Amino acid sequence: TPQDILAAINYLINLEFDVGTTDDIDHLGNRRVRSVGELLQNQIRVGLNRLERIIRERMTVSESDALTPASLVNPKPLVAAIKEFFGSSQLSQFMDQTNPLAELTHKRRISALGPGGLTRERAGFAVRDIHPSHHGRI
């Protein structure tokens, strides 16, 4: 909303008069964890965008009406997106199943790489340092 942009302009202007606090990029209050629900939701969003583009094209081309709902829905982009997410992702990893300790430790891994995360070439020293906000959490 434009009220949000006005408030952000107000905070940026007030920071030039020494009031307010600059933020930290490595602080664990500014970093969140995305598990399997959000990534499935995003991939299903992309597949549904493809599916509704297909359905809108199939409705706009067909001049004859009185169709069945099973004729307008093509499930193949959604299946392709779900299979792509579970097969060829950085996040979908071949499981460490050596012993119960390795199996338990692999499910609790917190990675900073992947799509929407980081690049290993763009990984400096400050992103590999230990932050004081990691105390107790990581």
Place this chain on the structure above:
DNA sequence: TGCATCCGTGAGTCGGAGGTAATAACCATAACGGACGGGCCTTGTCAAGC
């Protein structure tokens, strides 16, 4: 003519395992070409003879 901005160039060596991509008109008509079938010839064994 000096300083700011931009772009291209680099960033250790071996070994193992897993492992990729991922959706979208339809119809006539003639030209083309591989397959299949007889014709003739070339080729490869039996068999008797000096």
